[PDB]
Design a protein around this ligand. Sequence first.
Ligand SMILES: *[C@@H]1O[C@H](CO[C@@H]2O[C@@H](C)[C@@H](O)[C@@H](O)[C@@H]2O)[C@@H](O[C@@H]2O[C@H](CO)[C@@H](O[C@@H]3O[C@H](CO[C@H]4O[C@H](CO)[C@@H](O)[C@H](O)[C@@H]4O)[C@@H](O)[C@H](O)[C@@H]3O)[C@H](O)[C@H]2NC(C)=O)[C@H](O)[C@H]1NC(C)=O
Ligand SMILES: *[C@@H]1O[C@H](CO[C@H]2O[C@@H](C)[C@@H](O)[C@@H](O)[C@@H]2O)[C@@H](O[C@@H]2O[C@H](CO)[C@@H](O)[C@H](O)[C@H]2NC(C)=O)[C@H](O)[C@H]1NC(C)=O
Ligand SMILES: *[C@@H]1O[C@H](CO)[C@@H](O)[C@H](O)[C@H]1NC(C)=O
Lengths: 547, 413
Amino acid sequence: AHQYETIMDECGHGRFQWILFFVLGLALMADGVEVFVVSFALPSAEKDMCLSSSKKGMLGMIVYLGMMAGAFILGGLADKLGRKRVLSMSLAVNASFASLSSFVQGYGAFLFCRLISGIGIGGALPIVFAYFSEFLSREKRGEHLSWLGIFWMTGGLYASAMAWSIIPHYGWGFSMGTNYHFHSWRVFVIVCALPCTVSMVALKFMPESPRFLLEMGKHDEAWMILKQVHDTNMRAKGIFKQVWDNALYCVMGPYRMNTLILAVVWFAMAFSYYGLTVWFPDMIRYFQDEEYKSKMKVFFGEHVYGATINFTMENQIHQHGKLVNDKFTRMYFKHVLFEDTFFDECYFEDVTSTDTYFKNCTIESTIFYNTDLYEHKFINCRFINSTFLEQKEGCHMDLEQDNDFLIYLVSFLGSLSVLPGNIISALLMDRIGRLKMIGGSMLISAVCCFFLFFGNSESAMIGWQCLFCGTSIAAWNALDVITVELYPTNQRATAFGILNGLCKFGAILGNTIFASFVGITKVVPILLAAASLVGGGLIALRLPETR
Amino acid sequence: NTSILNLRYESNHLIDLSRYASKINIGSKVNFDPIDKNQIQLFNLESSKIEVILKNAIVYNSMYENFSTSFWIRIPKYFNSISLNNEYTIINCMENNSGWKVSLNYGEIIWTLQDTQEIKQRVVFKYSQMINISDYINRWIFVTITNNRLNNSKIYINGRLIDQKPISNLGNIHASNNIMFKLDGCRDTHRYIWIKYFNLFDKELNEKEIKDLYDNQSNSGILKDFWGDYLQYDKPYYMLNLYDPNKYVDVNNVGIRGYMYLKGPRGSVMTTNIYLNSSLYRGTKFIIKKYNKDNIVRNNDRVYINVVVKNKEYRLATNASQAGVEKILSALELSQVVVMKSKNDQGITNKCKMNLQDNNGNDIGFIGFHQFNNIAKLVASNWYNRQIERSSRTLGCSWEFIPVDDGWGERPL
Ligand SMILES: *[C@@H]1O[C@H](CO[C@@H]2O[C@@H](C)[C@@H](O)[C@@H](O)[C@@H]2O)[C@@H](O[C@@H]2O[C@H](CO)[C@@H](O[C@@H]3O[C@H](CO[C@H]4O[C@H](CO)[C@@H](O)[C@H](O)[C@@H]4O)[C@@H](O)[C@H](O)[C@@H]3O)[C@H](O)[C@H]2NC(C)=O)[C@H](O)[C@H]1NC(C)=O
Ligand SMILES: *[C@@H]1O[C@H](CO[C@H]2O[C@@H](C)[C@@H](O)[C@@H](O)[C@@H]2O)[C@@H](O[C@@H]2O[C@H](CO)[C@@H](O)[C@H](O)[C@H]2NC(C)=O)[C@H](O)[C@H]1NC(C)=O
Ligand SMILES: *[C@@H]1O[C@H](CO)[C@@H](O)[C@H](O)[C@H]1NC(C)=O
C-alpha cells in the first residue's frame, strides 16, 4: 500500500481527477433527484384531483424500501466484483426503467417502475464515493470528497427548480381517465433521467479503480492506468455467500464498534434531516390553512329573494338559509357549505364548485344546467319537482389558486441554503478534523432546532429551515469522509452500502413520523428531532481518529 | 261491439248507447275535454263524480256468469309521498261488501272482486315511476279485464295479457245496482284521472276480440302526441326520437347553410323516493301549420313544419340537389311540404312520422337523423321509406310530439 500511495501522491491533482469528479457528481445529482421525486413528487401525486383540501398520499414511500435493497445488493456486491461495472449496471438499469416508467398507463405500473428504478439507484452513492476515494491524493482527500457532496444537494435543487415549472398541479398520479394530454408528468419523468443518462454517456471513457484492480490482480493493468493518469496530469500541468460473509466481516468481527457507532450516527442524521426537510413544507401549508380557516363566515337565518349571483363567494357556511328565487350564473363555489337550507326555483348555470357540499337541504323546483355539482356533492338532500340537465364532465378547479408551488419553492430554498454552508466545510475539514466537525455540526443544528418552538410565521419557518439546512450539511460531508476513510479497500463498498441502506431506513422513519404529526402538536416532533441530533452528536465523538 | 254498457258522449249528452239505456247522473265538477268530449276528467271532489243506474235485469248476481270490462285511463304522475300505500277506489260496484271495484295506487292498477262470503281477490298491474321513458305514466292506457267464473280472472294492458289470478274459490257475487265513477279514500287532494270509452260485456273476452277492440278504439285515422291525445295544428310540440330517447333536437346557424342536429343526454327530473325520469321539455319546439276547418291533424295531411328558435318561427325545408340520398334538413326565414303519416301500407302503424316532399309531389323521404360527420344531422332519407316494408322499428322516422302538460310536473326553462 505504501508504493501505491507514493505513486498516487506523485500523480497529484489535475485534469483527470476533475473530469472524473464531474462524471461522478452526475450520479450524485441522480441520487438527489431520486430523493426529491420520492419525497415531494409521488406524495403530491396521489392527492385527489378534485379537492383543494386534499392530504398527501404516503404510498410511494415503498420505493425507499427498494432503495434499501439496492444499497445492500448493488452496494456490497461491488467490493467482490468491481466498481465501474457495478456503477455502470446500476445507473443503466435506473435510466432504462425510468424511461420505461415514462411510457406507462396506470398508477400501479408506474409505481412498480419507480420501485425498480429506486432499486437501481440506491446502490449508486456508496459506489461513487468508494470509486472517487481510490483516485485522489491522500493529503488532499477531505476537500475534494467534500466538494462531491455539493452535487448531491444541487441535484435536489435542480429537481425542484424544474418541477414547479413542469408539474405544478397535484393529482396527476391517481388519474388515468384523462386524455393523452396532461402528460406534463410524462415529460417530467423523462427529463428527471437526464443526469443519469449523461453519466452513462460519460462513464465509457473513465477507467476502473486502480487500487481495486491491484487488489484483484493483473498489476500490469494497474500500472497502465497509473501511467495514463500520470500522463494526463503531466500534460495538464505542463458468490453471494462470499458477499454475505464479507458483510458479516464488516460488523461482527474486528470492525465491530466502529461500524456500530457509524450506523448509529447515520441513522440519527438520516432520521432528523429527512424528517424536517418534509416537515417544513407541511408546516407552512398548515399555517396557510389555519390562516384561511380563521376567516370562516357563518351565516344563520338568511332570506335571499330574487338575487342574481355573478361573483365568487368563498369560505362560508349557511345554516337554515331560505334561498328563494335565486340565480347562480357563471360563478365559483370555493369551500362553501350548505346545511338545512331550503332552495326554491333557483337556477344554477355554469357554476364551478370545489370542496362545496350540500347537507340536509330541501331543493325545490330548481334547474342544474351546465354544472359540475354531481350527485356525490349532495348528502342526505331531498329534491322536490327539481331537474338535472346536461352537466360538465371534468375536474374543474381554479388551478391558479390550488397548486403545489409553495411546496417545491420551499424545497428549492431548503436545498439552496446548504451551498454557503458546504464551502465552509470543504476548505475546513483538513484543519478542525473529521470528528469535531460532525459532532459540532450536529450539536449546532440541535441548538437551532430548539429555537424553532419560538417561531410561528411563514418567514420564521422558512428562516429556521434555511438555518438548519445550512448547518446540517457539514455533518453529512464529514460523515461521508469518515465512513469512506475507515474501512480498507476490500470492505469499503460493502460497509458504505449497508450504512446507506440504514440511512434510507431512517429517511422512511422520519418522513413518516414528522409528516404525520402535523396539526396535532409542534413540540413533540421538534423535541424528538433535537433528541436524535443531540444523541448522534454525543456518540459521534466516540470514533477512532483519522488524520 | 254489441256491449251491455256503452257509456259514450253524443251531442252534449253522456248516454248509454246500448239497448237497455241505463240512467246517467253527472256531477257539477265533472270536466270534459273540449276537443274530444269523450275524454272525461275526474277530480278528488265530492261533486266530481259520475253515477250509472243499471237496469234490474243487468245487475250481476250469479256464481257462473263470465263478464268483462274495458276502458281507456290516463293517470297523472304521483308527486308527494302521501300517495304511497294509499289505495283509492276509482270505480265502485260493491254493495254490502260484495261486488267489484277498480282502484289505483302508487304505480298500481288493481281489479278487486269480493263475494257474499267476504272472500277477496285482486289482480294487479304495476309500473315503475323510476324509468327513463314511461309508457304508462300520464299517458293513455287501454285497460281491459275479463272474468271467467270457473278458472281465472285476467287483466290486459294495451291489448296484451299482463296478469291473471284464480277466483274459482269465489262464491256467489252480488254487485251493486249503481256504478260510481269517483275517487274514494284518496288522501292526496289534487289527484285527478282521465277516463274514456267505458264498455261492459256479459261474456269473457278472447285475445282476438281484445286486439280488435284495441285496433277499433285506437283511432289510427288521427295522429297523436306523446301523451296519446289528438295532435293539433298551431301548437308548440317538443321533439322526441324513439330510437335514441337520450338525445334532443337542436338547431345551428339559422339560414340555408345551417343545420339541425341532436345532442344528449336529455337530462333528468327527480323527486327523491317518488320518481326519477328523463327530462322531456328539451330541444327546439316544432309547430305544425296548415297548407277541414278544425285544428285536428288527420292522416294523409300535407302541412308545413316551423321550428321556434329565440321566439322566432323558421320554416323547415331542404334542397334536393345536394349529394347523396340524404338531404340534410335546414331552417329558413324549396322542398318544404311535409306529409303526415300515421297508418302504413294497409294496417301497420309506426307512430307519427313525417314525409318530406318536393313542390312537384316527388317523395324526398321520411325525416330522421343521420350521422353525417360527428354531428347527427336531420335528414330526409328514402332509405327509411324502404325500411318500413318489414313492419319493424324503423329506428328513423319514429318521432313523438311532446306538448306541455300539467300531468308531468316538469317545468320548461
Ligand atoms: C310539484 O308539481 C306538481 C305539478 O307540477 C306543476 O304543474 C303546473 C301546474 C305548475 O304549477 C308547475 O309549476 C308545477 O311543476 C304540483 O301539483 C300541482 O299543484 C298545483 C297548485 O296547487 C295544482 O293547481 C291546482 O289547479 C286547480 C285548477 O286551476 C284552475 O284555475 C287556473 C287559473 O287559476 C286554470 O289555469 C286551471 O286550468 C284551472 O281552471 C286549482 O283550483 C287548485 O287550487 C290548484 O291551484 C295542480 O293541480 C297540482 N297538480 C297535480 C298533478 O297535483 C305540486 O304541488 C308540486 N310540489 C310537490 C311537492 O309535489
Ligand atoms: C333536516 O331538516 C329537517 C327540516 O328542517 C328544515 O327547516 C327549515 C326551517 C329549513 O331550514 C329547511 O331547509 C330545513 O330542511 C329536519 O326535520 C325537522 O326536525 C325537527 C327536530 O326533530 C322537527 O321538529 C321538525 O318537525 C322536522 N321537520 C321536518 C320537515 O322534518 C331534519 O331533522 C333535518 N335532518 C338533519 C339530521 O339535519
Ligand atoms: C354582475 O352582474 C352584472 C349584471 O348582470 C353583470 O353586468 C356583471 O358582468 C356581473 N359581474 C361579473 C364579474 O360578470
